[PDB]
């Protein structure tokens, strides 16, 4: 249902832009949050952020100076934009979907495949 | 003639009935205070003839006493230490008046009903922060903070976080670095959104209050929303502006809130308090301080304001009673009587 | 934010053995702790919702419980398909933070 | 307490309804540093209340007997002016200071508006001679309540009444005047305050401003000509928008061409009204056609650093609506 | 601005009507600060204020604070407002609520519906707490810029002190003439220091029996300290000090009638100490004819540019009247 696409390589100071294509569901559906999870090589997971069609948006405060997430409903997809990528940002970037069903009882039920992005000169 | 700043609060630990104004036909009152005077603002009874008016606090709102600041179905007022700012709305347009002159305006963004905090706004230095909101109460309604300087709108601040529905925010200063607001939320939840505005960075963020004490009306039983702090529980439809003030002590920030007694009608009004903490991530219940208004009496909208003393500020909460205005203030200590 | 620690960070366990993984939140997270199974090369699969419940399709070998700060995930019988790195996150206050997770090696 | 001067206008490009005063006749507003007063005549006396208050007997101060009058502020004090064949009486602050006699032995009238003070010199328009015929206006320069100089205009002086005046700049006062008997086209006065000299010529603008009026452009003639519908008339609103590089001119007009109903707001920027036929742009409707929309007047609200052009409208006793140059966008 | 230290009074020997104000308002009192006098009263429930000289109404009045008993003073910089409504006493300074005082005896807390006396920045206020028909102690609160900084407990006869009228005898002394319900028709008198914040109460010795209902002066038959006939109920009487360079005059009011609250007379004595001086006060004249009611009577002082003017008012049932020490001769 979720599939990442975009550059597998950026150099320091460049903006990274990754897009997750949605199928079998819709980014226009207000019951879901869409977002990104980062996994540096050799490390565990770091949450980046998530957005809703209703306008709600959350980001990881250690990153929320350099990040924006756009929910591009007309093309049923969404994207992650990271500014000033420097080095420690090399990671697999995964997209995921979180229903707000029942009462916000779920955490990312659907996952993409991930896209590994290298940061290098 | 110098700018106001947030100041530490006047010593005291409890609230008591301070003053009751109970008779013009007015609605949705609020109080705003400058360096040496308080004014009681209300709208004169949506309709092109509605106006933002004021009388000195302690006066009965009559035609002889009331000054008409501007045409408006909604509005607010502020005092920056040099002068008064009068704000209001009459698609829709928001007008700003500074002292005697009209200055800037702002057009509905949502091209829908535009409203502002029905309360005093919060000024630091010459910069007044006003919450404005639009998009309709029945659905998604986005708020923005306008930074107003001598009547001009210099910056529009778009919040992050839970922003799908924020209305009728009661704001006050938590500290010299920030403004916090307890907001109404129609359609979606009994939990009030809580806004934190960073005035050094002009950045706003909204998260749902985590406390298990539900403050809006109608509400489900306290503690009855088995979700993460952020979730929307039941009975989202309806709602009303809550009272909210800060008690700024040298080492701790107290937070005072109002709630109706009715989980159904807008009846009675209770006072709740928590000292310290961080409401966005704090589920603990608010302590009950007392009853401001009995359950047999109307208790509608409530608002915070602060009275300026010569060397400290006094947190106060006012209550609308369909409409009479009751004022409760942080004077002395003991139970609220 | 809330800092979360997992333990043991590396686990050696046999097939048919019983596995217990513990999450230790520095602050209470009530009962909202989620758990995921990450097989190498794959996105983490959700296993556990509100400390327990259990995500649909999870083999019934997995179950979680706990409250406040100390929570566990157990595997009733370890099978080779359970080889994975497991992770947990706060699922209450924002800034969801994951612990380092644990590696479960099956022998 | 220093003398006022015209100042550049407050940034903004449009007018919006500001304030309505509603449950007196010939209302107007005049402003000085830190205050505005609403003036009107008592059905006769010249009275005032602080702007924003609803006029009541308890609230109203009686400045003088008058069936016609005006008011001004020079930065130090208020000037109150009025008429009651009649004499013009001039009061300054608390004292009655001077007078001016009728000159055509007829109904002496004034601006029914704010006058325009620069430095200590207040420029007042006075007129006599009778509405149904030739009526010559004069300007009086009033200093600390005394009439220091009378200014006699050149140009088309045949008929000038009820002039709405404001500053185009620090070196001149312009006025949009009523013209009964002869034309639907308003006379436009340019008063040079450096030289105390005035000229009057018709506004050349095709968009006739008085009421009753012919259709826009409906008179083939030079800028200087009179046309149809000369009998009847009403005072128009008029303010200037003084920008660093351009002078904007705002005018009011009734919506009906035949009746005192509704009120529209029109604007043109730059040019010379005495030799410029281009139509004024329509900014919007101040008053719907189902509502009175009668007399209108200009005034300016003084901000701490700049001035705000405002136009008020009379609505028949009568209510007063105020529109001001606040912000930008449509009215 | 500076503090309202008390000053010697404006010369004169007698009183006459200075001002009468007349058309639900009850228990009026007035107070004056530099350049300003206000008329205070309670509604039937807020403490309200109208500038002295205007007839109380809605348009000319303010609702300063919720209360069914209260008082006011000015310290030279700002007005202090006091009021109560197990009631709590609230203190408001200017526009801000600054402090409170809880019940003590857990009874009907009441104060002085007369005037608060400020010296320097320290305002002295009498409060009463205790039934009506029984023992009721009073305390003096010392209030500074709206805050209660000291509670003063009196010695002497303290079994019952209520609704006191206070004024300055000098820079270093405040004196008050207090009501006594239940125990005696004689009026208690409190002497309060300010240098030592010490109060003492003794019964006025003086054979004028300044209260109502009262006996004839055939009570006493007991040392000054004798709580004799009647005293039930009582009236809030009052007095002012004349403060002359050489002696202290003391001007007191007494209901003309010994039974109901009818009429009102003015009495004076100069010098001495009322705690141990039985001589009757001289009669100066009638303030209110015994045809008209004469109820609460408060003292206040009007500040002139260089001196103070002692004034005594009175309640009619409501309406009031002010008598002032103006010139000489006799009260008319
Ligand atoms: C804010 O800063 C000003 C600087 O003059 C200070 O006077 C004021 O007390 C401060 N307020 C708080 C709440 O810290
Ligand atoms: C000219 O107009 C400006 C407008 O701001 C004013 O400041 C200045 O004093 C005026 N000068 C004179 C002498 O009229
Ligand atoms: C008390 O001392 C002050 C000192 O300034 C003086 O003004 C005042 O008159 C004195 N009191 C009396 C009763 O004179």
Written as one string, the DSSP assignment of C32-79 is -EEEEEE-TTSPPEEEESSSSS--TTS-SSEEEEEETTEEEEEESS--
Alpha-carbon Rg for chain E in angstroms:
18
Sign of the dihedral defined by the CA atoms of residues B182, B183, B186, B192, in that order? negative
Do D110 and D102 meet the contact criterion of CB atoms below 8 Å apart? no
> What 3-state class would DSSP assign to B21?
strand
Do D263 and D296 meet the contact criterion of CB atoms below 8 Å apart? yes
Residues of chain A contacting B142 with CB distance shorter than 8 Å: 55
- DSSP-assigned letters across all residues of E161-188: -EEEEEEEEETTEEEEEEE--SS-SSPE
Q: Can you tell me the distance from the alpha carbon of C3 to that of C8, in angstroms, rounded to the nearest whole number?
A: 16
- DSSP-assigned letters across all residues of E62-118: EEEEE-SSEEEEE-SS-EEEEEE----EEEEETTEEEEEE--SSSS-EEE-SS--EE
**Greatest extent of chain A over all pairs of C-alpha atoms, in Å:** 47
Q: Can you tell me the distance from the alpha carbon of D96 to that of D84, in angstroms, rounded to the nearest whole number?
A: 14
Q: What are φ and ψ of residue B238, in 5° steps?
A: 95, -160
Residues 6+ apart with CB under 8 A from B120: B30, B31, B32, B33, B76, B77, B78, B303, B304, B305
Q: Can you tell me the distance from the alpha carbon of B336 to that of E76, in angstroms, rounded to the nearest whole number?
A: 32
Q: Can you tell me the distance from the alpha carbon of B132 to that of B159, in angstroms, rounded to the nearest whole number?
A: 12
Q: Which of E253, E57, E64 is nearest to E167 (CA)?
A: E253
Tokens of C75: 């595997």
Report the DSSP beta bridge partners of residue D253: D264
Cβ separation of E59 and B56 shorter than 8 Å? no
Look-up: residue for tokens 């009850």? E26
Residues 6+ apart with CB under 8 A from D224: D156, D201, D202
> What 3-state class would DSSP assign to E275?
helix
Cβ separation of C94 and B210 shorter than 8 Å? no
Q: Can you tell me the distance from the alpha carbon of B325 to that of B321, in angstroms, rounded to the nearest whole number?
A: 6
> What 3-state class would DSSP assign to D41?
strand
Report angle CA E129, E135, E139 to the nearest 5 degrees: 40
Do B92 and B108 meet the contact criterion of CB atoms below 8 Å apart? yes
Report angle CA E310, E315, E316 to the nearest 5 degrees: 135
Resolution in A: 3.2
Number of residues in chain B: 337
Residues of chain B contacting E65 with CB distance shorter than 8 Å: 18-19
Continuous segment of H or E residues that includes residue B272: strand B267-275
Which segments within B25-83 are labelled E, that is strand? Answer: 26-33, 38-44, 51-56, 67-71, 74-79
Tokens of C64: 């979680």
Do E6 and E321 meet the contact criterion of CB atoms below 8 Å apart? no
Q: Can you tell me the distance from the alpha carbon of E205 to that of B95, in angstroms, rounded to the nearest whole number?
A: 71
Number of residues in chain C: 107
Q: Can you tell me the distance from the alpha carbon of E210 to that of A31, in angstroms, rounded to the nearest whole number?
A: 82
Q: Can you tell me the distance from the alpha carbon of B142 to that of E2, in angstroms, rounded to the nearest whole number?
A: 52
Q: Can you tell me the distance from the alpha carbon of D129 to that of D107, in angstroms, rounded to the nearest whole number?
A: 7
In the sheet that holds D247-253, the strands lie side by side as D238-242, D247-253, D263-269, D281-287
Give burial (CB, 10 Å; 0-12/13-18/19+) of D122.
Answer: buried
Q: Can you tell me the distance from the alpha carbon of B232 to that of B190, in angstroms, rounded to the nearest whole number?
A: 8
Look-up: residue for tokens 């800028």? D223
Do E208 and E220 meet the contact criterion of CB atoms below 8 Å apart? no
Nearest CA in chain B to D321: B71
Q: What are φ and ψ of residue D30, in 5° steps?
A: -130, 145
Q: Which of E265, E306, E248, E219 is nearest to E7 (CA)?
A: E306
Residues 6+ apart with CB under 8 A from E273: none
Considering only CB atoms, which residues of chain C are within 8 Å of chain A? 1, 34, 36, 42-46, 49-50, 53, 55, 85, 87, 89, 91, 94-101
Burial E78-87 (b: 16+ CB within 10 A, else e): bbbbbbbbeb
Q: What are φ and ψ of residue D158, in 5° steps?
A: -45, -45
Look-up: residue for tokens 């009045």? E61
Cβ separation of E46 and B314 shorter than 8 Å? no
Cα D302 to chain centroid distance, Å, stands at: 17
Return the number of other C-beta atoms located less than 10 Å from residue D213's C-beta: 25
Q: Can you tell me the distance from the alpha carbon of D40 to that of D45, in angstroms, rounded to the nearest whole number?
A: 8
> What 3-state class would DSSP assign to B275?
strand
Q: What are φ and ψ of residue D274, in 5° steps?
A: -80, -15
Q: Can you tell me the distance from the alpha carbon of D260 to that of D314, in angstroms, rounded to the nearest whole number?
A: 10
Between the two ends of chain E, the Cα-to-Cα distance in Å is 38
Residue whose CA is closest, atom 3 of ligand 2? D7
Q: Which of E242, E186, E193, E188 is nearest to E210 (CA)?
A: E186
Q: Can you tell me the distance from the alpha carbon of D269 to that of E293, in angstroms, rounded to the nearest whole number?
A: 76
Q: Can you tell me the distance from the alpha carbon of A23 to that of A17, in angstroms, rounded to the nearest whole number?
A: 20
Cβ separation of E93 and B332 shorter than 8 Å? no
Cβ-nearest to B104 among D53, D58, D327: D327
Q: Which of E200, E194, E314 is nearest to E265 (CA)?
A: E314
Nearest CA in chain A to C93: A58
Q: Can you tell me the distance from the alpha carbon of D46 to that of D27, in angstroms, rounded to the nearest whole number?
A: 10
**Within 13 Å of residue E71, how many CA atoms lie on the same side as its CB?**
28
DSSP E154: P
Q: Can you tell me the distance from the alpha carbon of D173 to that of B229, in angstroms, rounded to the nearest whole number?
A: 66
Do E158 and E130 meet the contact criterion of CB atoms below 8 Å apart? no
Q: Which of E252, E163, C35, B83 is nearest to A108 (CA)?
A: C35
Q: What are φ and ψ of residue E131, in 5° steps?
A: 40, -135
CA distance B214 to chain E (A): 30
Q: Which of D171, D100, D92 is nearest to D139 (CA)?
A: D100
DSSP A101: H
Ligand nearest to the CA of E301: 3
After which residues does chain D have a break in its backbone, defined as C to next N over 2.5 Å? 23, 43, 84, 316
Return the number of other C-beta atoms located less than 10 Å from residue E332's C-beta: 9
D213 preceded by cis ω (within 30°)? no
Q: Can you tell me the distance from the alpha carbon of E290 to that of E152, in angstroms, rounded to the nearest whole number?
A: 39
Q: Which of B244, B246, B247 is nearest to B317 (CA)?
A: B244
Tokens of D271: 């040019």
Residues 6+ apart with CB under 8 A from A102: none
Q: Which of D84, D98, D15, D75 is nearest to D302 (CA)?
A: D75
Continuous segment of H or E residues that includes residue B307: strand B302-308
Between the two ends of chain B, the Cα-to-Cα distance in Å is 38
Report the DSSP beta bridge partners of residue E48: E41, E63
Look-up: residue for tokens 């919007």? D284
Number of residues in chain A: 121
- CA–CA distances in Å: residue D33 to residues B177, D19, D240: 35, 20, 19
Sign of the dihedral defined by the CA atoms of residues C43, C47, C49, C55, in that order? positive
Give burial (CB, 10 Å; 0-12/13-18/19+) of E285.
Answer: middle
Q: Can you tell me the distance from the alpha carbon of E56 to that of E49, in angstroms, rounded to the nearest whole number?
A: 8
Report angle CA E272, E278, E284 to the nearest 5 degrees: 75
Neighbors of chain C by Cβ distance (3+ pairs < 8 Å): A, B
Q: Which of B184, B204, B189 is nearest to B244 (CA)?
A: B184
Q: Can you tell me the distance from the alpha carbon of B286 to that of B288, in angstroms, rounded to the nearest whole number?
A: 6
- CA–CA distances in Å: residue D87 to residues B251, D47, D124, D126, E227: 73, 18, 15, 11, 80
A contact residues 35-94, partner C, Cβ 8 Å cutoff: 37, 43-47, 58, 60-61, 94
Q: Can you tell me the distance from the alpha carbon of B226 to that of C31, in angstroms, rounded to the nearest whole number?
A: 10
The DSSP bridge pattern shows strands E155-156 and E199-203 to be: parallel
D10, D12, D16, D18 alpha-carbon torsion, rounded to 10°? -20
Q: Can you tell me the distance from the alpha carbon of E186 to that of E178, in angstroms, rounded to the nearest whole number?
A: 10
- DSSP-assigned letters across all residues of B198-258: ETTTTEEEEEE---SS--SSS-PPTT---S-TT---S--S---PPPEEEEE-SS-EEEEEE
Q: Which of E85, E88, E94, E81 is nearest to E45 (CA)?
A: E85
Q: Can you tell me the distance from the alpha carbon of A97 to that of A32, in angstroms, rounded to the nearest whole number?
A: 7
- CA–CA distances in Å: residue B216 to residues B168, B227, B242, E73: 12, 17, 7, 43
Give burial (CB, 10 Å; 0-12/13-18/19+) of C84.
Answer: buried
Query: Among A108, A112, A114, which would you mutate to test the C interface (most chain C Cβ atoms within 10 Å of its Cβ)?
Result: A108
Cβ separation of B101 and D303 shorter than 8 Å? yes
Tokens of D31: 């402003």
Do D107 and D130 meet the contact criterion of CB atoms below 8 Å apart? yes
Cα D18 to chain centroid distance, Å, stands at: 19
Look-up: residue for tokens 């055509």? D104
Do D53 and B54 meet the contact criterion of CB atoms below 8 Å apart? no
Cβ separation of C34 and A107 shorter than 8 Å? yes
Which segments within D135-186 are labelled E, that is strand? Answer: 137-143, 146-151, 154-155, 161-169, 172-178
Ligand 1 center from residue B252 Cα (angstroms)? 15
Tokens of B226: 């088995």
- CA–CA distances in Å: residue E217 to residues E185, E225, E261: 10, 15, 18
- DSSP-assigned letters across all residues of B96-139: EEETTEEEEEEE-SSSS-EEE-SSB-EEETTEEEEEEEES-TTS
Give burial (CB, 10 Å; 0-12/13-18/19+) of E52.
Answer: buried
Burial D226-249 (b: 16+ CB within 10 A, else e): bbebbebbbbbbbbbbbeeeebbb
Q: Can you tell me the distance from the alpha carbon of E81 to that of E71, in angstroms, rounded to the nearest whole number?
A: 6
- CA–CA distances in Å: residue E247 to residues C92, D270, E239, E241, E328: 79, 83, 16, 10, 17
> What 3-state class would DSSP assign to A105?
coil
Ligand nearest to the CA of D306: 2
Q: Which of B211, B70, B248, B326 is nearest to D51 (CA)?
A: B70
Give burial (CB, 10 Å; 0-12/13-18/19+) of E23.
Answer: exposed
């Amino acid at each position: 249902q979720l599939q990442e696409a975009g550059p597998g390589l950026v150099k320091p100071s460049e903006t990274l832009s990754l897009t997750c294509t949605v199928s079998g569901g819709s980014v226009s559906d207000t019951s879901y949050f869409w977002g990104w999870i980062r996994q540096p090589p050799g490390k565990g997971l770091e949450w980046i952020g998530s957005v809703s069609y209703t306008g709600d948006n959350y980001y990881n405060p250690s990153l929320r100076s350099r990040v924006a997430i756009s929910l591009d409903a007309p093309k049923n997809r969404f994207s992650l934009k990271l500014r000033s990528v420097t080095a420690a940002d090399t990671a697999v970037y995964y997209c995921a979907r979180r229903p707000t069903h029942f009462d916000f009882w779920k955490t990312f039920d659907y996952w993409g495949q991930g896209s590994l992005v290298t940061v290098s000169s | 003639p110098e700018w106001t700043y947030p100041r530490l609060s006047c010593p005291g630990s409890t609230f008591q009935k301070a003053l009751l104004i109970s008779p013009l036909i007015i609605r949705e009152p609020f109080v705003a205070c400058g360096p040496n005077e308080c004014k009681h603002f209300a709208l004169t009874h949506r309709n092109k003839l509605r106006h933002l008016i004021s009388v000195k606090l302690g006066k009965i709102p009559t035609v002889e006493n009331s000054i008409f600041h501007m045409a408006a179905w909604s509005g607010s007022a502020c005092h920056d230490g040099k002068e008064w700012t009068y704000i209001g709305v009459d698609n829709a347009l928001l007008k700003v008046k500074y002292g005697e002159a009209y200055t800037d305006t702002y057009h509905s963004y949502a091209n829908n009903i535009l409203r502002t905090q029905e309360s005093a706004c919060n000024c630091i230095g010459g910069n007044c922060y006003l919450m404005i909101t639009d998009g309709s109460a029945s659905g998604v309604s986005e708020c923005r903070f306008l930074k107003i300087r001598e009547g001009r709108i210099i910056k529009e601040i778009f919040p992050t976080g839970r922003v799908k529905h924020t209305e009728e925010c009661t704001c006050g200063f938590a500290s010299n670095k920030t403004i916090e607001c307890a907001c109404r939320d129609n359609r979606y939840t009994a939990k009030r959104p809580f806004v934190k505005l960073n005035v050094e960075t002009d950045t706003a963020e909204i998260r749902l209050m985590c406390t298990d004490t539900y403050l809006d009306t109608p509400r489900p039983n306290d503690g009855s929303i088995t979700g993460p702090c952020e979730s929307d529980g039941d009975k989202g439809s309806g709602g009303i502006k809550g009272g909210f003030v800060h008690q700024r002590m040298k080492s701790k920030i107290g937070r005072w809130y109002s709630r109706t007694m009715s989980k159904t009608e807008r009846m009675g009004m209770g006072l709740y308090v928590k000292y310290g903490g961080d409401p966005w991530a704090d589920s603990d219940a608010l302590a009950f301080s007392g009853v401001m208004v009995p359950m047999k009496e109307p208790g509608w909208y409530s608002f915070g304001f602060e009275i300026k003393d010569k060397k400290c500020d006094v947190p106060c909460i006012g209550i609308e009673m369909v409409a009479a205005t009751a004022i409760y203030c942080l004077m002395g200590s003991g139970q609220l009587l | 934010d809330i800092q979360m620690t997992q333990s043991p960070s590396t686990l050696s366990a046999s097939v048919g053995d019983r596995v217990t993984i513990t999450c230790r939140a520095s602050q209470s997270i009530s009962t909202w702790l989620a758990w995921y199974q990450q097989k190498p090369g794959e996105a983490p699969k959700l296993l556990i919702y509100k400390a327990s419940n259990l995500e649909s399709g999870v083999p019934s070998r997995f179950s979680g419980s706990g409250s406040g700060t100390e929570f566990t995930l157990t595997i009733s019988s370890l099978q080779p398909d359970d080889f994975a790195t497991y992770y947990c996150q706060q699922y209450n206050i924002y800034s969801w933070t994951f612990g380092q997770g644990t590696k479960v090696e099956i022998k």
